[PDB]
Design a protein around this ligand. Sequence first.
Ligand SMILES: Cc1cc(S(N)(O)O)ccc1NC(=O)COc1ccc(Cl)cc1C(=O)c1cc(F)cc(C(F)(F)F)c1
Lengths: 400, 532
Amino acid sequence: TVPVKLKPGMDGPKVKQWPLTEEKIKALVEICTEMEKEGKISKIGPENPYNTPVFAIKTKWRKLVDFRELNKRTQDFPHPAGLKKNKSVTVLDVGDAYFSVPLDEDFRKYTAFTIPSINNETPGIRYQYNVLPQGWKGSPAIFQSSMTKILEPFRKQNPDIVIYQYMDDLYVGSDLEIGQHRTKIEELRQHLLRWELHPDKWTVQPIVLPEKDSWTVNDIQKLVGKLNWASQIYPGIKVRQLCKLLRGTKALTEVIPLTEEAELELAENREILKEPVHGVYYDPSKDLIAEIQKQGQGQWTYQIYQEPFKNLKTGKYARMRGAHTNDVKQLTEAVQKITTESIVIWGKTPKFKLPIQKETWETWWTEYWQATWIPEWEFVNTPPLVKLWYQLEKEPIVGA
Amino acid sequence: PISPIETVPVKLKPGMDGPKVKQWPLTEEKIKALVEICTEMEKEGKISKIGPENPYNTPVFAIKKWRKLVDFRELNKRTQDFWEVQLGIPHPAGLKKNKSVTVLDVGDAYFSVPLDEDFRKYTAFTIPSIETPGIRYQYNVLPQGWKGSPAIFQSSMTKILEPFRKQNPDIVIYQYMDDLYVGSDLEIGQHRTKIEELRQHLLRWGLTTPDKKHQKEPPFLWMGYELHPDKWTVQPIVLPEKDSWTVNDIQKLVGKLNWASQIYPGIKVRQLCKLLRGTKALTEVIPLTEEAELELAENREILKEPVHGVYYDPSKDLIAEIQKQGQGQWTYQIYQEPFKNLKTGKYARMRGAHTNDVKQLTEAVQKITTESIVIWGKTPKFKLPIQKETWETWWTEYWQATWIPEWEFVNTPPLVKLWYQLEKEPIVGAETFYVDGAANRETKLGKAGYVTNRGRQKVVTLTDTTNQKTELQAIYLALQDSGLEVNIVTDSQYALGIIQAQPDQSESELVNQIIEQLIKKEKVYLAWVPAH
Ligand SMILES: Cc1cc(S(N)(O)O)ccc1NC(=O)COc1ccc(Cl)cc1C(=O)c1cc(F)cc(C(F)(F)F)c1
């Protein structure tokens, strides 16, 4: 085993376990006993003060540990820009690989986790890892030499296919037709068994200003307000001529004929929004940020950026079948999608700005989480304009 | 007797050292009592007579025959941290009904467990003299009052318990501080035998169980409740009768009464709380008002109510009904079968900066949901005083992500509804007030008013005001002077928020007035436009 340590001055994580459903507790209990036997983990005393949240996801349960805090405190240790171009990418869960590898003995105490007992009837069961834990930053790292080795063949055999490893995940991307792609994957899983994304289509949609037979005082008002704000992203947007028609105290419903200057002004603005603001470039030294707005009726808008108004990417996510009566479900779904694209494109997860109440999210997000990694997040209060603005994003002619 | 169980490796906090606290000098009458108590422990193997080698020391005292008290506050400051000793406490509403239960006070099981030999030296203390060298000792077992003792004990029990636990699944043991709560549904004969079996097993590890004398018997007092076999009750709540009430008394009283509002229906403390206004001292005597006297009266009577509940039958549904007692005040009860509650509650009015009832409704739903999961590990089926069409109309459009687990409508007034819904579009044929308000934020002098499309106008002069207040006031006037249908334009940023969240309650009296007004209109359209 190689000696791993925490960043200088960093102490072990002591994150409190959130309550879990009986169903989930039973599951973890079963899962952990089995691991205990296989010597993957061991019960621990109270002398170990650390702890990390744990839970179960998905028809059987998979154990998911929340190592965000530990990953952060773990000492530090490349991205293939070609992945983002590939026609299709399939993701694979390779966390099982780790269990074989032993975790340095002196570091194990920091992986300590707790299984909760319903109605505090019994103190929870304490465990710590002996082997590489899935979800920990160090695991994919430590098990790197080993991963290359097992990948070399397939890679060298197919230099046309790009493979990228993120945490427990492996993103394999090629250009073959759908069938020939899925075939190459199995050839890989088989290769691994012995030890559906599409980037080229992720098109950047533009902001689209309304167009009306006739405009009303209101129509302009709402319009001028949005253009004004948007002025922060495109300095060339002008509302002068538009604000002139808005002179006086007419009824909000009265129709205003447009001057030709206003018509041109509107035209220049439409042309400016035709494309994404210039000079936006990704910076590795800076964190990625993803903001989500609830547009409502299953529609959501997001923008990935590092500097305000300098979007690296923006998009729309429509809820998925069988998620209607659940806001939280849609949101977690979208968070996972966006995080995925984020990894695919930059090889890292963005910190999230979620339009939801801390308590609301922390009570139900795990119920629909399906990735092995967990992004960072913070809760916010959507500024009405930001919402109105991206609500203006263009959509397919008929669809797709 | 001590236990033949492995010790847990204890360490002192990072780099710090063992305590060197001077021994508080005592009287010959106390030294004698300690010397004795210590000789008894010494023979029990709990403490070891030691030499000068030890540079550490903790103060020992004498309280009441006499009882010894060692002050480890210092050692505790220098002792490593442990996994928090179960912080959440067991709630009666979460107890499955067992046919039989037995309490086993593994009391001084603290002294029952050995101390990591490596660590014992830091526990050294000294029995003074009548000037001459005192008698030195050190603990060979978990000390009473020491930081890690509770944690270690609990764990020790745990190991010891693993076997039996594993051998008798149809049985349940609840670990809590000094006691073990053991229940089952076998036959009283069989149960009793297991108890005796467990008991016996414990002694097998130097851990000895109670005496027919200390054995506690139902009902059981759990956090103010009384635990009866087939149901639970509340220990009687006593409201002292006096002719002289001090501040302290009233607060104390309000305290006890607040807790009671959880279990008892109808408890009120408004008038009593009023008494605290401008109080200058705790010992200050505040004469009860007439209303205060009555309130207190009616409450004395409500506490004469035999409030009771049932236990947890997992094989049965879990239901939670909610009511809106007042604006921001919510009451709820969780029962499996009608009228047989397991637990009930009320959430103190929340004073947000701005929000609405449907929102507050989900918040109640969410605190309850989290509660349930801790108590039962499941989430209840909700009976909420709100229509499905209402819920649907609000949630689908609200800027924030929200949700309510499976629920159903229960028509039990008052019902929670949307007090108003701003128009999606400008209203045709409705006046259009262009409102606006400005004010020297420094001189706090300002004006506000409007100018409708129909030519109507106004401006009001205001002193001691802020720009926000003027703007909102501009909106308020518009609302006043308008008809049941009105369009309002405003460059107010705070109005933008209203359009988004359409709050029906806030912290500003102003907003409040506006809301009242909004509520009263038949149709309102609020449009925002940038300033200048
Ligand atoms: C109160 C009672 C007496 C009898 S009996 N043996 O007839 O006297 C049988 C069942 C019950 N009660 C029940 O059915 C439900 O209660 C229980 C069901 C199972 C178990 Cl093991 C304990 C209780 C308790 O009453 C209880 C009492 C306490 F002081 C503290 C605690 C706790 F562990 F949570 F801290 C639990």
